[PDB]
């Protein structure tokens, strides 16, 4: 098979070996696209993902590579934005971005601050009880947004009663 | 159902054979943080006395109160760093490159070494700098000896030579620091490396106890009850099962005890000084009188009196340093009584 992807006017994409770099007005995203007998190349105006094999496993990755490149285009133009809301029931949770890491203080009454590191060129902006995770690489944004939701993970007690934590409001 | 029990003795300090060098050899060194410096010093064990202290620990309910602490006295006279050895990073680990020596030698260093008469300190230094340019230079260490002549109680005049590491800033700045100490006369004191209150690692070759049995060597039981009178008192039950048809090296057997290298971790330096303040009345039993550069190390230190012990800043400390502890009283009372 062969799937040709037309690159938008805002974007320019270079490629060497197995690594694809996609540059645009919102930033730069570099990913490695490696799979048996699948060739990803730049035709100046289009990105070609082709293979000689048409089996289910190869076909699965041709489709995954497409949605990865398509996502890199939308990332370098409009960008990726995840929205979050901080909720608490008794203890006022102090969420703050300190350095290259988003730190949550006084969660569920804890003296010790819970902290996770931000992945790459992802920007986390706080405006009270609302958080907006944004950036060009979906891999980075998606995970940083997830890391925050996972930072308030509670296993010891009932989730239905102890509902405190930052949660994903808007998925792009 | 036969109760469980941990094995007799540790398998980590094996094999329990005699030490190759009576002078201890460190296998680990501290990390490169602050200002460049020699990562260790050495002295000669003198004996034990107690010291009264003021509790430094902020988390102790006794903070500020009188407290008795057992202390071992070690005579630590200035050492001489006679050379700068350089190592290169090879595909087979670290290997020595060249050495930068000196002209000033201690009167009796020829009792151990074949003292250099003709050396090129410049071509040696050049090889090290051309290797640093190449990005092949590993670490920087100094060849160092002791002046046992400065210690009257120790019979030997033959210096104990040992290598020590210099860590600190950049590899370029510590090369300079290293060469700078050597080019003079290589003289340095414990004040140059340590400060009272810091945690140090003391290495030593233990008190030699010759050949001893399992009860002393591995701490196995003695034969109990009726078994004790049968002809077997201090011998273990068996040397292993039927199968495997061999004796494992893990079964407690007789042999050499003592005269083993031990690196005792996290030893507090209570005080570093000079003179006769820690000496005991009538002299230290089986040693002598202390009058000169010393160090008071908290608790026990491996080895007997007169033996050479080595120092190093703790590679893994548990507590944060509480510098220069207040000494209210050092006992001088005779160790005979």
């Amino acid at each position: 098979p062969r799937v040709e992807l037309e690159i938008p006017e805002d974007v320019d994409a270079e490629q060497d070996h197995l690594d694809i770099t996609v540059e645009g007005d919102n930033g730069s995203v570099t990913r490695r696209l490696w799979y048996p007998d699948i060739d990803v190349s730049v035709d100046g105006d289009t990105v070609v993902i082709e293979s000689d094999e048409d089996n289910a496993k190869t076909m699965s990755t041709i489709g995954t590579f497409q949605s990865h490149i398509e996502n890199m285009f939308h990332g370098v133009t409009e960008g990726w934005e995840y929205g979050m809301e901080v909720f608490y029931s008794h203890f006022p949770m102090q969420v703050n971005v300190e350095g290259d890491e988003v730190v949550i203080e006084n969660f569920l009454g804890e003296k010790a601050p819970r902290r996770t590191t931000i992945h790459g060129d992802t920007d986390v902006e706080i405006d009270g009880e609302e958080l907006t995770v944004s950036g060009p690489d979906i891999e980075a944004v998606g995970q940083t947004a997830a890391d925050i939701e996972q930072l308030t993970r509670i296993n010891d007690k009932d989730v239905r009663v102890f509902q405190d934590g930052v949660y994903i409001t808007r998925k792009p | 159902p036969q109760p469980s029990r941990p094995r007799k003795g540790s398998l980590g300090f094996g094999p329990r054979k005699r030490s190759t060098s009576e002078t201890p050899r460190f296998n680990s060194w501290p990390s490169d943080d602050g200002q460049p410096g020699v990562q260790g010093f050495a002295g000669y064990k003198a004996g034990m006395t107690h010291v009264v202290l003021v509790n430094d620990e902020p988390n102790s309910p006794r903070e500020g109160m009188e407290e008795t602490v057992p202390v071992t006295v070690i005579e630590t006279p200035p050492m001489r760093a006679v050379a700068l050895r350089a190592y290169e990073d090879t595909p087979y680990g670290q290997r020595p490159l060249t050495e930068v020596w000196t002209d000033e030698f201690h009167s009796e260093l020829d009792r151990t070494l074949d003292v250099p008469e003709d050396h090129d300190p410049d071509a040696a230094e050049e090889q090290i700098r051309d290797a640093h340019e190449a990005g092949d230079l590993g670490d920087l260490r100094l060849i160092t000896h002791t002046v046992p002549d400065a210690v009257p109680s120790v019979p030997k005049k033959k210096p104990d030579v040992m290598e020590t590491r210099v860590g600190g800033g950049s590899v370029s700045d510590r090369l300079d620091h290293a060469l700078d100490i050597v080019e003079d006369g290589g003289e340095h004191a414990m004040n140059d490396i340590f400060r009272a209150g810091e945690y140090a690692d003391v290495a030593g070759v233990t008190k030699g106890k010759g050949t001893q049995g399992p009860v002393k060597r591995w701490g196995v039981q003695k034969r109990k009850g009726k078994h004790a009178r049968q002809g077997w008192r201090r011998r273990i039950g068996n040397l292993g099962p039927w199968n495997p048809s061999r004796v494992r090296s893990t079964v407690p057997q007789q042999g050499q005890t003592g005269y083993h290298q031990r690196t005792e971790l996290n030893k507090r330096l209570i005080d570093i000084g000079e003179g006769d303040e820690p000496t005991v009345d009538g002299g230290f039993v089986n040693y002598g009188e202390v009058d000169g550069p010393y160090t008071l190390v908290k608790g026990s230190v491996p080895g007997p009196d007169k033996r050479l012990v080595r120092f190093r800043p703790a590679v893994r400390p548990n507590d944060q340093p509480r510098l220069d502890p207040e000494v209210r009283y050092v006992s001088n009372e005779s160790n005979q009584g």
Partner: protein, 142 residues
């Protein structure tokens, strides 16, 4: 330090066993072989299992011993020993006339033998000997 090699083989992106099988046959034919870039040598399959086979070989032993090397240096050397009758006079001479090296300490580039190369573009399920050694707990000196 200096080895008068007749043949210098490049193990980079080459299937270890296939190279070793040829390096054995040549060693018994009187050639003085030298295997180069063994850190970058390849072994195909699922990494997880390959590591388990080698990790077990490290943990296996007793008082008599079973010395299994952790570095990619010795791992390749042992593989070659496995294809040679090393207890016999003719086999020990052959084995000792074969030496494995990390990187390329020579001036010449090594030759890649026929049918030994792995096409990276066609394969994703393999490991580098350096990857195996890093997992075994060896010191990365390459």
């Amino acid at each position: 330090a200096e080895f008068d090699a007749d043949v210098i083989v490049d193990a980079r992106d080459c299937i270890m066993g296939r190279v070793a099988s040829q390096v054995a046959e040549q060693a018994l034919d009187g050639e003085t072989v030298a295997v180069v870039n063994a850190e970058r040598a390849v072994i195909t399959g699922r990494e997880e299992q390959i590591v388990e086979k080698y990790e077990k070989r490290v943990d296996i032993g007793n008082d008599n011993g079973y010395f299994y090397p952790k570095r990619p240096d010795g791992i390749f050397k042992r593989t070659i020993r496995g294809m040679l009758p090393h207890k016999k006079q003719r086999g020990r001479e052959a084995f000792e006339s074969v030496r494995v090296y990390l990187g390329n300490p020579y001036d010449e580039d090594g030759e890649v033998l026929d049918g030994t190369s792995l096409d990276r573009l066609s394969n994703i399920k393999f490991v580098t000997l350096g990857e195996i050694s890093e997992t075994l707990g060896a010191n990365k000196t390459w």
